[PDB]
Amino acid sequence: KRLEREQKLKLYQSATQAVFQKRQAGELDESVLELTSQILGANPDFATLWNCRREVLQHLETEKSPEESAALVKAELGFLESCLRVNPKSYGTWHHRCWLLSRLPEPNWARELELCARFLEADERNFHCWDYRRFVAAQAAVAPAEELAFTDSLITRNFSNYSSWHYRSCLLPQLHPRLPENVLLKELELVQNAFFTDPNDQSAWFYHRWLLGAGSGRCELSVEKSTVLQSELESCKELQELEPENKWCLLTIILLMRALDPLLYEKETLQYFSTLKAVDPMRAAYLDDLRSKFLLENSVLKMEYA
């Protein structure tokens, strides 16, 4: 342990030394690509070395044949993919890939989308990869509807869904292009499946709270939406019975009652705040402030009675 890393250190130190010497000498060649490959594998956050690689690739592009140039970029893609397998959360590595692809005549975007699907099946929460996927989708002019279909299969195949629900929150407005009610109802159905399938799973509850605000007034509640929301309310009460320590369903009961009729449900809303605070005491201060806000809203509604 302690010995072998005294060796590694002096290797990285002399290779680092060697790279900086070559750079000061203006030697922008495959030397320096060889040296930095040996350092960036274990230390991808060494930003200056990614810069050195770019300076070399730029220089060589001017002095090499188009086929030699093409060969260097394919080698770079393989290098990059090997680096990502060891450290998939390095800002520098993902940016270098983006820099490289943006430069190309040329680029094979469907292959890059596949790379993304592969990294996301390993870690569905890797934000770097989701950011890269959005980059690739915009470059390839992938339509929001295709990306929407990708997110569905991801949410249903397993949990760890916050990143995929978040992506849906951005896509849905684009394909729209404040959701239309037919879309909102279908989303509510999808999310309500999720949180009844895995009531633990905070991401569906967060997305549902957004959906509850993303509609028309209420009360310009349609009979269909009124009925759907009332149905949700009763389903959450059932889940409360199955899972008495589940705080998300309790909060959602409160929010549904707000969405339906604040004044008619005043009594129940207050009862639910008490239960919820006992179940989730770390959020007592938040919940008291939420209750205070809701009561002030109620006073305004009552004072609107002429």
Positions that interact with another protein (CB under 8 A): 5, 9, 12-13, 20, 43, 45-48, 50-51, 54, 91, 95, 99, 125, 127, 130-131, 134, 160, 162-163, 166-167, 169-170, 200, 202-203, 206-207, 210, 281-283, 285-286, 289-290, 293
Judging by beta carbons within 10 Å of its beta carbon (0-12, 13-18, 19+), is residue 275 exposed, middle or buried?
middle
Closest CB to another protein among 170 and 264? 170
Dist. CA 233–CA 217, nearest whole Å? 18
CA distances from 6 to 46, 80, 91 (A): 19, 27, 27
Closest CB to another protein among 196 and 206? 206
Closest CB to another protein among 223 and 282? 282
Judging by beta carbons within 10 Å of its beta carbon (0-12, 13-18, 19+), is residue 88 exposed, middle or buried?
middle
What is the nearest approach in angstroms of another protein to the Cβ of residue 223? 27
CA distances from 56 to 23, 53, 142, 206 (A): 10, 5, 32, 47
What is the nearest approach in angstroms of another protein to the Cβ of residue 48? 4
Q: Which residues contact 298 (CB under 8 A, 6 or more apart)?
A: 262, 263, 266
Closest CB to another protein among 79 and 130? 130
What is the nearest approach in angstroms of another protein to the Cβ of residue 20? 5
What is the nearest approach in angstroms of another protein to the Cβ of residue 37? 17
Residue type, 144: P
Residue type, 234: E
Q: Which residues contact 187 (CB under 8 A, 6 or more apart)?
A: 168, 172, 179, 211
177 secondary structure, DSSP code: -
What is the nearest approach in angstroms of another protein to the Cβ of residue 67? 26
What is the nearest approach in angstroms of another protein to the Cβ of residue 72? 18
What is the nearest approach in angstroms of another protein to the Cβ of residue 140? 15
Task: Compute and round to an integer the Cα radius of gyration of the chain.
Answer: 27
Closest CB to another protein among 45 and 114? 45
What is the nearest approach in angstroms of another protein to the Cβ of residue 203? 6
Q: Which residues contact 181 (CB under 8 A, 6 or more apart)?
A: 215, 216, 222, 224, 225
Closest CB to another protein among 43 and 235? 43
Closest CB to another protein among 121 and 127? 127
Closest CA to 275 of 302, 299, 306, 252: 252
Residue type, 254: I
Closest CB to another protein among 133 and 225? 133
